Design a protein around this ligand. Sequence first.
Ligand SMILES: [Co+2]
Ligand SMILES: [Co+2]
Ligand SMILES: [Co+2]
Ligand SMILES: [Co+2]
Ligand SMILES: [Co+2]
Ligand SMILES: [Co+2]
Ligand SMILES: [Co+2]
Ligand SMILES: [Co+2]
Ligand SMILES: [Co+2]
Ligand SMILES: [Co+2]
Lengths: 172, 172, 173, 172, 172, 176, 173, 168, 179, 179
Amino acid sequence: DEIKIVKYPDPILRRRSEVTNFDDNLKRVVRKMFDIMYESKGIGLSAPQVNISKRIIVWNALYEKRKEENERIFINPSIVEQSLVKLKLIEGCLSFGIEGKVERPSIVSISYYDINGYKHLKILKGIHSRIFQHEFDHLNGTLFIDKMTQVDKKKVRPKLNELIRDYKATHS
Amino acid sequence: DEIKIVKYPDPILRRRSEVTNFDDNLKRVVRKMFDIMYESKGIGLSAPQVNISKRIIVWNALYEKRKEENERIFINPSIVEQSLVKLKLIEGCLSFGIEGKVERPSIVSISYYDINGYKHLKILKGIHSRIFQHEFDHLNGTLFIDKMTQVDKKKVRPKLNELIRDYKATHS
Amino acid sequence: EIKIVKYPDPILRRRSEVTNFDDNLKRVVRKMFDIMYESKGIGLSAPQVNISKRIIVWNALYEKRKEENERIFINPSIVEQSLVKLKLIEGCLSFGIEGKVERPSIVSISYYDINGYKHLKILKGIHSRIFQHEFDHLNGTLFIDKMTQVDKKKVRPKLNELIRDYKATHSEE
Amino acid sequence: EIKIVKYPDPILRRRSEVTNFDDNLKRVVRKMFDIMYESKGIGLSAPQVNISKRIIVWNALYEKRKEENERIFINPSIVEQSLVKLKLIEGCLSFGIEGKVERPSIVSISYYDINGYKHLKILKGIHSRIFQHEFDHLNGTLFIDKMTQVDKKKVRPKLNELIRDYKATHSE
Amino acid sequence: DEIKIVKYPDPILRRRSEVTNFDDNLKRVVRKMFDIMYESKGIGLSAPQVNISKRIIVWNALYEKRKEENERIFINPSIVEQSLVKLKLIEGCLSFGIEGKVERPSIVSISYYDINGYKHLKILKGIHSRIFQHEFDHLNGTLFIDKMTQVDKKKVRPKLNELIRDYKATHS
Amino acid sequence: DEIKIVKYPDPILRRRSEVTNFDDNLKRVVRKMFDIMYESKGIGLSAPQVNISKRIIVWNALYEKRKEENERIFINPSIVEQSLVKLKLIEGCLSFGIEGKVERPSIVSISYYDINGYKHLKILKGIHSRIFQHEFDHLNGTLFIDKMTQVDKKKVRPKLNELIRDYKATHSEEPL
Amino acid sequence: EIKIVKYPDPILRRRSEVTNFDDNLKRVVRKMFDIMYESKGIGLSAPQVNISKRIIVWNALYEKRKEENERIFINPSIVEQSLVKLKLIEGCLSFGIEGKVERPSIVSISYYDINGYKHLKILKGIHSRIFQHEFDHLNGTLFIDKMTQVDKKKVRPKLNELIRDYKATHSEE
Amino acid sequence: EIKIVKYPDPILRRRSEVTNFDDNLKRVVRKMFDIMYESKGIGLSAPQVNISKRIIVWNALYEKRKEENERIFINPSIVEQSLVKLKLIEGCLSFGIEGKVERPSIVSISYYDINGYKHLKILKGIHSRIFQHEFDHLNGTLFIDKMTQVDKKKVRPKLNELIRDYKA
Amino acid sequence: DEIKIVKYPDPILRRRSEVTNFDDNLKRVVRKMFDIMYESKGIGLSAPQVNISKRIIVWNALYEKRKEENERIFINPSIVEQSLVKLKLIEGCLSFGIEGKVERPSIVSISYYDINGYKHLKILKGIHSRIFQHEFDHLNGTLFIDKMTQVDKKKVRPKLNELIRDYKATHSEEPLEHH
Amino acid sequence: DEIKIVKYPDPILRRRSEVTNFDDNLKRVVRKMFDIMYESKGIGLSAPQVNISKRIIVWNALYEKRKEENERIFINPSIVEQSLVKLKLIEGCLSFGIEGKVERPSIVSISYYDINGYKHLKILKGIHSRIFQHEFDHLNGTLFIDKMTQVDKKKVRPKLNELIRDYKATHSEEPLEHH
Ligand SMILES: [Co+2]
Ligand SMILES: [Co+2]
Ligand SMILES: [Co+2]
Ligand SMILES: [Co+2]
Ligand SMILES: [Co+2]
Ligand SMILES: [Co+2]
Ligand SMILES: [Co+2]
Ligand SMILES: [Co+2]
Ligand SMILES: [Co+2]
Ligand SMILES: [Co+2]
């Protein structure tokens, strides 16, 4: 429930988030994330990004003008199937003031759990499939710079290094 | 590729249909299928039911009033995930003058190919989710009598025996 | 009980049980006429008001309710039936669904009144119709079981809708 | 036949057979009525006129022979009798004797008309009494078999007189 | 004479029924065998199924409408010949709330004795063939589960164990 | 497929008929069998009676008014059961311009093959059971004069002797 | 006795016995006549009413029942017969069957009347026919024994039919 | 053959022979009738006119000769006789004597007509009487042989008269 | 060519009539056959019925008015198929003063040869059919009293017997046969 | 019930048709049978020719003017007798744009059943006896080219092979059988 966005070289971000068990009254965690997300002008957020190794993901395609129920909460998700047609779009990420291009499938077939424990199945496509794929990768210790282009990773190496240095200058 | 509708004890109704390869200019196959279903007045139809051992499923929830592209066509489907809530619904089949309840999941995550061989991802729910599942089973040799309720399979027993005998007079 | 029950309810499929104590609960038969009156219906059995008791009530003139135009049939039994059958259109209070059912036209009958006394009657009529619908409720038989292959087929989606609607009893999901 | 038969005749103890040909033997039914009107009785059955067939007729108002009051019942069956019973006086064209007999008040019946049409009826009262009497005739049961121990006794002489009178046969 | 229909596990159901001697005045045995069957809503019955280990077999192809002389009765029977052509049909049994597909020869040639002791010869074919063979197998200690397919045997395991549980409460 | 009614003494009528194998395209043999029988005004007939040592039996219970499929055909018959009750009836035979009383059981339970060779199972009762057993004996080299009574065999002595000498005129190279 | 016997009875093959008591059982002779009249038969003998006695009765004009046109014969015996014979078509009441038998034209008869007295007589015509039929019956000879190959064969089905019906009578199993 | 032979003539004691040729010799039967007519006799047999042949003829009404009323019997033979007997006065054309004899009343007969044809016949009465008289003639039996002990003794005188006439 | 009708007990009426060969110069056999027919008030006639053991049959449906070529002639006949539908009619014969019911098929498929020799095929139905099978039966030695009903066979026995005695006067110079 | 006329090399044309059983509510079968015969400009038709291996024969000897009750129908036929006199007439058959002479007897004795199953017996003579004989052979799987003449069968070899070729284009995704 932290007011802590985390940054690139923190090793939590590379860990494996754990399955959520008790599905009740910690929707406050889901609130903390959203709050953090809303104030960091971000589109999506995973729990690892606020120091919680839990398989939680949220987002809002319209965060620029917040509204409950335009919000999308996905507990313990999995990608059941995915398309063949892929797409190189641009992505950013609240753990990186960086931005670049990453190729991911266009359409994802999903299974997940709601805020009270109930399973759902859904096809996400559009900007929703883009952010799911992003935020789902956080839950597995994959960052978007792992999926980035050889060119772009090079085109962004200095700011990867700066982020590495600001981290370096911190430990108790 | 027939106007030959099949009936219960045909051993083709038990063989596992094979995957479709030549995905063009044999929409007449699917056209035959629709016709035999239309005149027999029934909601769905898979290829095995017209003596073609191929992975083709078609249907139309609105069959009292025929309409193009109100028709559903599914080549080479597969069930990638299914709901947890299941529902006991009365069901019918063109290869059985019989009807009765079978319990199947309510919603299903689908993956199939269209008539031109393009893959699609889809969440089928409700009545459309019911028929798909009936027809998918035909592609796998599963008949709806195998999943029926103990009360119904008993209530329908004489009719089933009736149909076996009728069929056995196929040979003399 | 002001509980008409809807289709998929498992009580409608149980065997209704013989009335033993044949006196002073008449309000049970009154609860029944009252629901059947209020629900705009012609006949009523106790399983339809969630009571597994072999009781059957009706009124060919229910759009003009009048006592003693009311018929009560406790612990009934069909001793004979006419060989001539009739295909009439039926409905039921456990279903917003409708279809043609074929039942013998006339039925020889035996039963017991509100007081405990046995009787013998030849029900021929719409009385013969209803008795036969309502007796079946007492033995877990419902009119869709006797409906025609075609009306059965036609009425499948709606029947399923009631299953979906009913399944929403444990649907806090 | 203008053959009224009397008590000790053994035909009265046989079992009468079901009518097969329902037509042009309403004459048999006419003489049963004829005999019956001529001997001042209210019921009669075919064995009583020396015909071993399941035919029963009556008229509860035999003191004014009115056709529309006449009742024919061919191949009868008692489908149900009542619980409550009744001791009523009874006589018989086959016996100049009289007395009480206990029989159920109301009967549920099934029989065929003079042309063979099957009907279902509840007889109660005077007609339930006669039927039950007359039905017994078709089974080889006579009313003295069911008589009260008091009356059977009080009716010893007459019965023995009838055995006497009948024995003219072979006592020529 | 017993209203003791037996169930799967009882040991009498596996003994070899003994040949009927004294072919008379135990017609009630047969009647009480029909009685039991009639109330159990069953198509056929053998004597061991009512705890009499005698070689008696009865049935009615239309038990759903009970008429006499629609009743078939077979005493001390044997199968003199049987068809080569065989048939899988779905069978049930009054000793088992269970059901399965059993393959039997289609036509049998029978020799038997009736209710009076006279040997008869008959070719039973069809639905009368099925039932005879079922019930005959009771006279030999064969049960229908002995000839079920593996699949159906497995598929009905729990109920066979359920019936064995229930039985052990005899010696509770 | 011969028009050869054979008569009493012929040695082949005492032979054991062999079992049929080609169960197709030889209907005419059986048709000729029927034909021969018809023009001889006879009730039943088996293949040896037309000089064919094959296990084949036919008859028409109503041959004074012939109809197709009113005729009966049995290929490779066999007797699976038979009644205890016997019955003494008068029989005739096309092989013998003779008649007499032979006891055979009332009912026989049977198995055979059709014109196409599918096995059957039938109960013959009555005249069908009477004729069957007459014609089945032929397939086994059993003629009805064996199963007769001493009376009816005596009473028929001189016609068998006429038949025996008629037969010796197959090779009548002498005035006898 | 009303016991008309039919073909396959064994009694019809037995040797009847000589009448001894020649009095007051003359109604047995009438019984025979009655049996004959209702079965529309021209003749009849004691074996065929199931009486193994030597009695022969007939009325050659039986279409007109008339006493003294009837002929009774007790303990007959044939003493002479014509060299000349006749093949006439006969019936017998023990068979629904018909056929030709070659019997001599005229026979010379010795017999006894109802009361025991002997008579000598010459039978000629149809009376000679019938006598020789009925006399044969009293020696266990049937007319199928004197029939012709051709006629014997014509009536074979009918004979077997009668044999069936008989074996049946005793134990219709 | 004319004159009726009388009693002691030995021919009346020889057995007559069966006729073979049922011929156009009805003249033989006719003479017999003539002779029989002119001696006012009811019966005659061929022996009596010296024809040892088995022919018996009569006419119960010879009083008025009527051809159809005549009875011929060639080669007769008795085949049965009545048990009841009868004593009747007999007379014979070979004797002026007369007396009672006891024969059966009725006879079952067999014989041959004028053409060879065989017949069977029940003779009763006077034809039964006369047949039995003339049949004996065929067998050389004479009616005094069967006569009563009474009448035989009673008439022996007259037989002696006949016996004497036989002389010269 | 005989002018003699025949009667029941003649033994020739039970002899198998022979097949005709020489098909010419004997129209008079047929003529005399017809000649006999009219004068003996009978509808048809077969050759054995005039003492000729040869397979010939002739008739006239309308013979109460003689009309030549309204005649019908059938040499060497053979019945090749018959109706399934049977019929009972009162039949009679010129060899009997006797009449009764006989059951015969309604329609018949025939084959026969003409007076010149040529073969023919014809379906005969009704009364022609009826007359055909009577006269045809004669040619095989079958007489309508073989096919007579049990009732009419019995009802006519005296008569049939009477006809036998009648016939026995063929050799009756003797007295042992009466009339 | 097919609008499928079949051609020469079809093997069904050589099969022996089965005996028709259920004689009701299959008048359409016969009607379809008739329908294709008028549009294929033809005089005769048996059921194997429309791909029904059943013993059915129909014809109309005036089809240039189609008239009901001028149509002839023959269920389950047989030939009980045939004429001795024979005749070479020109024939053709709808499973062939081909024609030739075929010697068949002139007249035939027949038996069959109508549309309801009543056994009839009949004499066919002329155009009727010709069509029947042809059409009947189809039910026994005999084709007119088997009875065609030595001259005419050789004269028609080409067209017979063309149809063998053209039939072979049934299984011809293989183009070498274009004709
Ligand atoms: Co991120
Ligand atoms: Co299906
Ligand atoms: Co209801
Ligand atoms: Co009474
Ligand atoms: Co069982
Ligand atoms: Co034989
Ligand atoms: Co007799
Ligand atoms: Co003298
Ligand atoms: Co004639
Ligand atoms: Co053709």
